[PDB]
Amino acid sequence: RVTVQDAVEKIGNRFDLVLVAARRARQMQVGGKDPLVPEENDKTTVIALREIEEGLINNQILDVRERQEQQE
Amino acid sequence: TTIKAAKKMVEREEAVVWDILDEVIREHPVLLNRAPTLHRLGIQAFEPVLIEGKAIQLHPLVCAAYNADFDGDQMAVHVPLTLEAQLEARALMMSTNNILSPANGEPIIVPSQDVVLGLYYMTRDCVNAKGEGMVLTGPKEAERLYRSGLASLHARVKVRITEYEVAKTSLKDTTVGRAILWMIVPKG
Amino acid sequence: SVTEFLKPRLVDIEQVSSTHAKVTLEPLERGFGHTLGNALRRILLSSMPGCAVTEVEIDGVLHEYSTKEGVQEDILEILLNLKGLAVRVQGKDEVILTLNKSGIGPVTAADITHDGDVEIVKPQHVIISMRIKVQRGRGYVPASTRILVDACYSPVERIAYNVEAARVEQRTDLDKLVIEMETNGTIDPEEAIRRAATILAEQLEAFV
Amino acid sequence: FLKPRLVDIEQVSSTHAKVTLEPLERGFGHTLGNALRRILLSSMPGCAVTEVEIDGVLHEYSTKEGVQEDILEILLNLKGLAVRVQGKDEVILTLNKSGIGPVTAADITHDGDVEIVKPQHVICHLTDENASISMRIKVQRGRGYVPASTPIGRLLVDACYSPVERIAYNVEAARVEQRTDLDKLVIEMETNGTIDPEEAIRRAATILAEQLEAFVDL
Amino acid sequence: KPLVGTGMERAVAVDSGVTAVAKRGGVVQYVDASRIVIKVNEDEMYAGIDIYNLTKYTRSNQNTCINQMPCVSLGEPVERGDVLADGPSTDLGELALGQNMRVAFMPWNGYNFEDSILVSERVVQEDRFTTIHIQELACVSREEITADIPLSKLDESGIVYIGAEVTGGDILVGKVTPKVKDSSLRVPNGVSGTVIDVQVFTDKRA
Amino acid sequence: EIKELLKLGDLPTSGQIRLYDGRTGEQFERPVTVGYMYMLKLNHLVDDKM
RNA sequence: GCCUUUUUAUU
Lengths: 72, 188, 208, 218, 206, 50
Ligand SMILES: [Mg+2]
Description:
Strand order of the largest sheet of chain C: 1-2-9-8
PDB class: transcription/dna/rna
Shape of chain C: elongated
EC number of A: 2.7.7.6
Strand content of chain A: under 5%
CATH superfamily of chain A: RNA polymerase subunit, RPB6/omega
Bound molecules: magnesium ion
Structural class of chain A: mainly alpha
Radius of gyration of chain C: 21 Å
Shape of chain A: globular
Oligomer: part of a larger assembly
Entry title: Cryo-EM structure of Escherichia coli paused complex of transcription termination (TTC-pause)
Chain A: DNA-directed RNA polymerase subunit omega
CATH class of the largest domain in chain C: Mainly Beta
Number of domains of chain A: 1
Keywords: Termination, Intrinsic termination, U-tract pause, Transcription pause, Factor-independent termination, transcription-DNA-RNA complex
Helix content of chain A: 55-70%
Number of helices of chain A: 4
Radius of gyration of chain A: 12 Å
Largest sheet of chain C: 4 strands, antiparallel
């Protein structure tokens, strides 16, 4: 998007933000994973950051979503 | 749905190639890179749009960050391919979050020559100007005051402004050119 | 071939408020997006009819430097807020307006009287036996040449145009004209550019 | 709210022309004067050379035996050539110039619809008596400006579809007629001569009024 | 010509060898862009007349055009020190490195944050700054000249003829190896234009 | 000597003259210095340096 | 299909 200052206040560290957004982008590319955000015509780079703008995607709650996919 | 006929579609340059292209480059980060990088700000990412002419339109606000004027300097450009490298360009290498310099507390985004010159001609005080000593309802009315041409850009008037930190209002001595700035600055 | 030109689709028509609006005309011809925005800019600021106050008459106040007693308002603020009044009249051109207030309290545009066809669409902003005259005017007049207030005759407050590149899959560097505007609310901002369209069209019926 | 009329057209020559726009209101003379100035330079129907096909020489750089001016500067004189067509957008013109003497624009054979308003325009100069030149001048009608990039012997040139060259407008004082806020606007047009200066303001106002119909749609 | 220059500007053209300088003065008889002849006067002659073959649109060292245009008319007498034909970027003996444009030292809505130039469409229209770049595409044939690959730009000889409007990415000179695989050269993208002349030297093009 | 040369032509003695804007149509409050300054195109072109 | 020197030129 325009700026990333709203997504960095939810996680803190900037390099932890790239790790959680890359794993969110891998699920949106190969294994489906339709996002909870309203889908627009932008690419998956902005969708990986728009989910952290309100705080529905974090580095702690993405690992429990990977284990939820492994149980199914 | 192949690799052989897709090369023929690119080299033919028909109408359907550019509509595919603007979807890819709508929000793709692209690293603009000077060939001498003696500073950290020599590599900055951008979200480009498709234009005519084979030259890159490097932003003037980051022109002082590159420490390189538009003197005909030929310099590189780079893209990240994968999505874990594109997020490195948007969260770290973008020109939006590169405001402050790593060297000092002053920002590296400093208006150097022309945009500061347009700001300096507005923020000035002149006597015997067109429309000297008139009231204005707000800062947005100064755009109406200047574009019609009945008043000068620099005239000692009293404009109403709304300052924030919650909103306070006072009638202070403010010229016509400084009243253009109040619609530009944020609230706080 | 020479008479056919690009017509905009008028897709992005958004309004952040009832007064402020940002429209987008895309696509346009190269070199046309600046001249279609600048000509309709000066029409809305200098060549359009409107309604505003003309003269202020306060009891005991004949100069611009005075102080009112009994109310929590000054002279320099009482003619400034009245300049940006969202006043509109359609039946007659010149109309008078009165204001009656008693006691200690704030004055606004809600408790005032209409006195006929005068309509007030913004009663929330802050503005005694004060009589003012509201007449029809074109554009904007100053208070320096009238030698007793400047009249904000045009209903719009600010209009700026920006032009970016547009793509029509056959040509390049075409103009994409956006227009941000904010008015007093007497007319609609979608109708404000439409009113400037009929003003410019009435000047071209003798040529066409 | 006053309709301007073309009440007077003063032309000192076929190149430079001046029209009058009266009556206009105050604040609208700079508005309508700038809006008509931009569109006249943006897109107007002008006739210029698009493709040149010369017998003998194939491409646009090889010099021809029997001429004095270089063949790349011949195309510059063809770009300065002012022609006017009436009913057909594609026309074919020929030189068939033989003998001594400079090649002028009046030597070009024109049809009933094709008219050259600048007969004193010199294309090139011929210094050889027995050598002669003959080209196929192809003139298209369009607007704006197109490059030469966008038929081996048919060499491609760039076409300049701008019938005007410079537009001069200024706001002057008009007569009163018992009304204030009234000013005079004149427009001086130094044209190539293809379009009528009375019709130059009229056709630029048609495409201005057609672009304002989308402003009625919003 | 430069609208503002120096008195040295008339001396660079008459001292350069790429600009045609007449060895003997006199009137002219046949002025062409290919060659100019000068009728030598009775005092300048020793007979006959001299000839001056003007290099028209030849390749320079930096892949740039060099062409010699005449500056005198028919029947124009010249002296020994005069110029009969201006060279590349020259007119009438004055060195014209560029063109005098109406320069306004002012910014316009951007485009002048640094010392870059905002140019008119009139400059693009009247060819006031468009130049010619003549690139060389040499063909080392160690390798037959026939273009039998396993087009319209060839004259059935494998060599492109004079005046073909080539495009970046087509075959220019056919060169096959005796084996049959195609390993010839092509034109790169972005330099699409016409050919001046194809110099074949050591078979129909030769 | 240049200001004396400006008195010969129809344009005034001052080096900067007032003129209108292209996309706006308004006369500048500060006159700019127009003129026929000699400019030249270099060898570094974008068709070869891209 | 390249590589290395040398020269010119650019920041
Ligand atoms: Mg530099």
